[PDB]
Amino acid sequence: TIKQFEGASAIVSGGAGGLGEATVRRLHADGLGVVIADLAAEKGKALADELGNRAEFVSTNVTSEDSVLAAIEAANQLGRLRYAVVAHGGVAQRIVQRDGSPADMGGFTKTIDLYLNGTYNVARLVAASIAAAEPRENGERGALVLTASIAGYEGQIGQTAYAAAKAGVIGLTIAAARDLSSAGIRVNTIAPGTMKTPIMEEEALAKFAANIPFPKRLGTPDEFADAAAFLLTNGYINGEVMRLDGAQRFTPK
């Protein structure tokens, strides 16, 4: 168990599959108690049961205060909650559709609610719990990793809602780091490119791969988890957005 993680626990939103699952497995392997915070109950309990004692599934709706507070209470029974990775994941619509109609507002607000409001709701509640922990000798109480997307910098046709939500998370990063600096809680963000998430898991894989300089493939969940673990453990990285994208820059289509 790595020194920073001694006595500690973590929450991973979207922890039952994909990028979140890989993050859970990495943090668990590195010695943290981990709460799998997700709505996918069969997958989440299977993962928690596989990993054993230091992994617990909690059915968690990221936009509900009471649901996230229950995840926090669960994490504080595995150790002192000091870390969180907000990795919850998940159709395109142009702002003016091909028939001339505007984008449906409901679709926009649902995307903002899940990816931006959900990220803030998890961050504020987890941060308030971490703020109450004893600092380590270096002054740090803990750290958060948020998940954006390079769509927040280079949003694509039909993806204005996702681009706006993920840009919101990108801009949140430095503001939250500044806010939480008095508590010694670092905040950083991973902006992935095109990742091999469950929906992606070999013909149409070449179409994405084609715009990706190197490696010429989708990024793996384990690569994401490695990035998240680095942001939790490096003591000077703060208020930063890390692009994790094989040097891809999104084209319009």
Added chain:
Amino acid sequence: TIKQFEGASAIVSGGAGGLGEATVRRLHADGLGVVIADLAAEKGKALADELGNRAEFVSTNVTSEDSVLAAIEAANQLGRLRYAVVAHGGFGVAQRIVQRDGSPADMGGFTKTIDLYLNGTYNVARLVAASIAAAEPRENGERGALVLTASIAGYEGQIGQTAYAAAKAGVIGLTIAAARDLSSAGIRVNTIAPGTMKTPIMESVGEEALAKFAANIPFPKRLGTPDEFADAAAFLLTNGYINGEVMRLDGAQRFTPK
């Protein structure tokens, strides 16, 4: 009247005061019919009356489809709607993520800020873009142009202002995505990210705090004027090649944490 604006109309959200008022005055002087889209009824009506028959006040809640659709119908009586400047202003909720007593920031305060500055911007943009997309293009292929308003808080958010920072960062990121979306319609989309600007709401902080703000600003060593904002907005509407861009308008200021 400049060729771009002949026969055309524009909607300015937040048009009744501050940055929006200056934009209305500028676009009206440049030959556009203008709809002052605002909830400030007395100020808005007064401005519309002062400017005359090519300026109309429409009471507009930017988060309401019905209300924005009414502003669009009014604009289309003043010419063909080709332009909008989304300039509704004010502050976000002032609260730290973790507050002094250890409690978290109020989620309501955050979502209200996102609703007004991000969702409100998207709602105005989607409805106005749909109208403009139905217009005939000019010889150069362009049907119209939108200017959204962000803030440099979107890049350099401050302590206690995570809600505003998130909302304005959302607008910043929306810019290139919307420009890409609307490119098949020939509608340009750009955004102004103001620094600290001289508006009534800003000046409510009192002279001592304003003096502090002016000190962080390299040159000019003062708050930006509404007329400077209006001039940038007009430029984004008229220059034919600027698209998907965010323009910082800030006297070279970079926000410090506090």
Added chain:
Amino acid sequence: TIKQFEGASAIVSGGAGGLGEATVRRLHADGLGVVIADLAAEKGKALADELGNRAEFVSTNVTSEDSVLAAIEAANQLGRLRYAVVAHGGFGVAQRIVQRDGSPADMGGFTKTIDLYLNGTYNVARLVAASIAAAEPRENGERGALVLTASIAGYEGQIGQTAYAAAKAGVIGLTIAAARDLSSAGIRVNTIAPGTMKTPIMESALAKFAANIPFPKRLGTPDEFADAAAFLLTNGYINGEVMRLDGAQRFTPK
């Protein structure tokens, strides 16, 4: 003549043709005395001759102090030098970091590109800024303003064009630093980062270029560049900013 420009003069590097020429024409029409600072002598002189006695051509190598100083002297005979647009164009060396045959990029090619686009920009800026700093400020406190030219290659550099990407990114980063440095003199500094523009080389497969350009689906015009440069010179609050002028293009690798 707009009041910002009354009694004032300007230098445009690369002014003989392309983006620079459109800029010279615009600034001259707006009432400034203009020096065309360029090495293309016949083209530059013909432009100065066409525009008349408020336009002068000075053969200028942007990396030579004495050469730029002579352009400044000429400018100060046409009015008080308050503005410059650094618009000297062309491409960098076209070469991969590691070439087809396994050999590294030629260092001379890289350094030539850096010298022309980055060192050349700084040399013009420092000398023009020194001159402008000695001018009397206007009532608003402003002595003058500079516009630098970068490229979106500085953000999204391309295969075979690392030299140009590095030089132009240097210009991008210089912008805020120079604005802060010159803030005490009341000299604003901003930069235009063009996308794919219809420069003289493009006068002679345009659709291949325009295919990655969202809207307008064409190359940017010199007049659109000049309009952006005029705005950066006249708007009183824009400072330390880089303006992308690219029809929403984002450069692909190739």
Added chain:
Amino acid sequence: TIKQFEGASAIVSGGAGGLGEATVRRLHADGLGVVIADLAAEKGKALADELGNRAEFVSTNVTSEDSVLAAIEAANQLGRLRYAVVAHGGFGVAQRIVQRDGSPADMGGFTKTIDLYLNGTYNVARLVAASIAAAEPRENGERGALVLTASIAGYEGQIGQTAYAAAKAGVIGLTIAAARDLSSAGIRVNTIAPGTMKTPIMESVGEEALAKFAANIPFPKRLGTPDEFADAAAFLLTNGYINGEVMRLDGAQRFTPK
């Protein structure tokens, strides 16, 4: 020995001291053969001797092709050269673009800074990349990786430091271009942009002056350590999907004008 580092070697420019030294020690600890490429011969030799037979000192001027080629030959006696961290630097004198007496900054000061930080970086990169491009790829297609060092000054350059800002911005912009250029060879290219770091230059800095830096750094409220830089470099060399990226390593600091 880290799996990616099996049988491999690395060059670290500026490897004799400060950020480079910590990087040498971390890479060596992780199982790489390391070449300390630096002009500081006495420090460099002492470090190579302390670390043992998997560390070698080579006196290297980063702007000399033959000098850098000698470092690459040395690296290839220690393993297959697959990695480099370009962490060299130098002493700088502040100079404003227009000085107090009205004179312009000395061009020589600007070109020397560009030569060391930008040209020097490119010279090391092209020669190291050429050698790495000849190595057999791993099964994942990767031949190796480079880490360049910039500075947050390349985003937020400071008064009197225009030359350093321009040079470091050049390195920043080079990152994505070099990653694209080298993608067909399977050589990743990333960059660290440090904030204010505890390097030998800071050893004698006063308690008041340390407080001044700390007051602008949100958290941790102190200078970054060389080991923290080294840890970032090791991550960029090992993570298989990070490419063409600039990593700010700065305690959330944003540089103010002064």
